[PDB]
Structure 1
Amino acid sequence: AMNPPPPETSNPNKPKRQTNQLQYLLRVVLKTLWKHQFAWPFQQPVDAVKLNLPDYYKIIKTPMDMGTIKKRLENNYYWNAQECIQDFNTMFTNCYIYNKPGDDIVLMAEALEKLFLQKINELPTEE
C-alpha cells in the first residue's frame, strides 16, 4: 500500500560519459516532451497512494517516468543512448498495460509517444 522508492538515478559504481546522442536526448528530446501539454502525468513517478491506485504497483513492476529519466541524464546514469530510449519506451508501455484503451491517460501517452518517436528519428551521429 506504500509507494515503492523511485527508480535509482545516480549510481556511484557505474562509469560515466557524455556522448552527443545522450546530450541530444536531454537538450532536445526530453526538453521537447517535457513542454508538451500532455506531459504532466508523466513528469514524476505515479503516486499510487495520493491517487488511491492500490494495484498500480501490483501490476507495474518496472515503473518509469520522465522526471526519473531527466535525473538519469543529468547524473550521467546512462552509458548508451539505447538505455535512455528504452526507459521512455517502458514508460509508455506501462501506461498501455495498466490502463484500458481510450482512457484519457492512454490517449495522452500515444500523443507523447508519437512525438518521441519523431524526435529520436532525428538522433545525431555516434562517435
Structure 2
Amino acid sequence: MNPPPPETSNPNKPKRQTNQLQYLLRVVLKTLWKHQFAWPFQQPVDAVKLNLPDYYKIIKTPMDMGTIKKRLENNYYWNAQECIQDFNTMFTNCYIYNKPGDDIVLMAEALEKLFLQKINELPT
C-alpha cells in the first residue's frame, strides 16, 4: 500500500513568490536535479514498485524533489525557509530509513552537501 503523495496545491494555504523562492527553483532544484545521484529522489517513493513494504511504516512525512519542484512551480510556499525544510525532510527521511554507509545514503550525503553549498548565499 502506498499513501497518497504529498499535496502540491492547497487552495486555503496562502501563496507567495519571492526572489529566494524563484532561485530555489531556477538554480537550486534544477541544478540538484541533474546530479548523477538525483534520480532516487526525483519522485515519491513507490513502496510497491521498490518492494519497500515498511517504507511508510517508518517514514511519516515523506518528501521528494518531484514534489518540491511542483510546489515551487505552483507557488505553494510562503517563503524559502519552508521549501528548504522540505529538502531537509527529504534528506533526513533517507538517513532514517536506511543506515550509514548504504549506497543511497552516500547519494543523499553528496546531494545534501551540494544543496547546502547552493543555499549558503541566496538573493536578497
- Provide the TM-score with structure 1 as the length reference: 0.96
Query: 2:121 aligned with 1:119, yes or no?
Result: no
Q: Which deviates the most, 90-99 or 11-20?
A: 11-20
CA distance in 1, matches of 2:103, 2:36: 13
Q: CA deviation at 1:22?
A: 0.3
Residues 44-55 of structure 1 mapped to structure 2, 5 A cutoff: 44-55=43-54
Q: CA deviation at 1:100?
A: 1.4
Aligned residue for 1:70, secondary structure, equals helix
Alignment correspondent of 1:91: 90
Q: CA deviation at 1:123?
A: 1.0
Q: Which deviates the most, 10-19 or 99-108?
A: 10-19
CA-to-partner distance for each residue in 1:15-66, whole Å, 9 max, x for gaps? 2221100000000000100010100000000111111111100000000000
CA distance in 2, matches of 1:28, 1:68: 16
Q: CA deviation at 1:12?
A: 1.1
Q: CA deviation at 1:122?
A: 1.9
Aligned residue for 2:62, secondary structure, equals coil
Q: CA deviation at 1:13?
A: 1.1
Q: CA deviation at 1:73?
A: 0.4
CA-to-partner distance for each residue in 1:57-115, whole Å, 9 max, x for gaps? 00000000000000000001101110000000000000001101111000000000000
Aligned residue for 2:49, secondary structure, equals coil
Q: CA deviation at 1:14?
A: 1.6
Q: How many residues align?
A: 124
CA distance in 2, matches of 1:30, 1:18: 16
CA distance in 1, matches of 2:117, 2:123: 13
Query: 2:2 aligned with 1:22, yes or no?
Result: no
Q: CA deviation at 1:124?
A: 1.0
CA distance in 2, matches of 1:18, 1:51: 35
CA distance in 2, matches of 1:42, 1:107: 13
Aligned residue for 1:122, secondary structure, equals coil
CA distance in 2, matches of 1:103, 1:70: 26
Alignment correspondent of 1:102: 101
